[PDB]
Amino acid sequence: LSDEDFKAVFGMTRSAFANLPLWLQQHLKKEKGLF
Ligand code: NA
């Protein structure tokens, strides 16, 4: 997805998401039905 769609889904930038721990990245992907 686009940078704008990413920010809408996750409410943060891709760089912000990458600073999260893996467990939380994975948690968010599942919560949102993505990836
Ligand atoms: Na929106």
From Swiss-Prot:
Chain intervals for the UniProt region annotation (Absolutely required for activity): 29-32
Location of the protein in the cell: Cytoplasm, Cytoskeleton; Cell projection, Microvillus; Cell projection, Lamellipodium; Cell projection, Ruffle
Signal peptide coordinates: none
Domain of life, per lineage: Eukaryota
Organs and tissues of expression: Specifically expressed in epithelial cells. Component of brush border microvilli.
PTM annotation, UniProt: Phosphorylated on tyrosine residues. The unphosphorylated form increases the initial rate of actin-nucleating activity, whereas the tyrosine-phosphorylated form inhibits actin-nucleating activity, enhances actin-bundling activity and enhances actin-severing activity by reducing high Ca(2+) requirements. The tyrosine-phosphorylated form does not regulate actin-capping activity.
Protein task: Epithelial cell-specific Ca(2+)-regulated actin-modifying protein that modulates the reorganization of microvillar actin filaments. Plays a role in the actin nucleation, actin filament bundle assembly, actin filament capping and severing. Binds phosphatidylinositol 4,5-bisphosphate (PIP2) and lysophosphatidic acid (LPA); binds LPA with higher affinity than PIP2. Binding to LPA increases its phosphorylation by SRC and inhibits all actin-modifying activities. Binding to PIP2 inhibits actin-capping and -severing activities but enhances actin-bundling activity.
Family: Belongs to the villin/gelsolin family.
Quaternary state and interactors: Monomer. Homodimer. Associates with F-actin; the association with F-actin is inhibited by tropomyosin.
Domain notes: Consists of a large core fragment in the N-terminal portion and a small headpiece (HP) in the C-terminal portion. The core fragment is necessary for both actin-nucleating and -severing activities, whereas the HP binds F-actin strongly in both the presence and absence of calcium and is necessary in actin-bundling activity. The Gelsolin-like 1 repeat is necessary for the actin-capping activity. The entire core fragment is necessary for the actin-severing activity.
Protein name per the record: Villin-1
Origin species: Gallus gallus (Chicken)
Name of the coding gene: VIL1
Portion of the full-length sequence here: 792 to 826 of 826
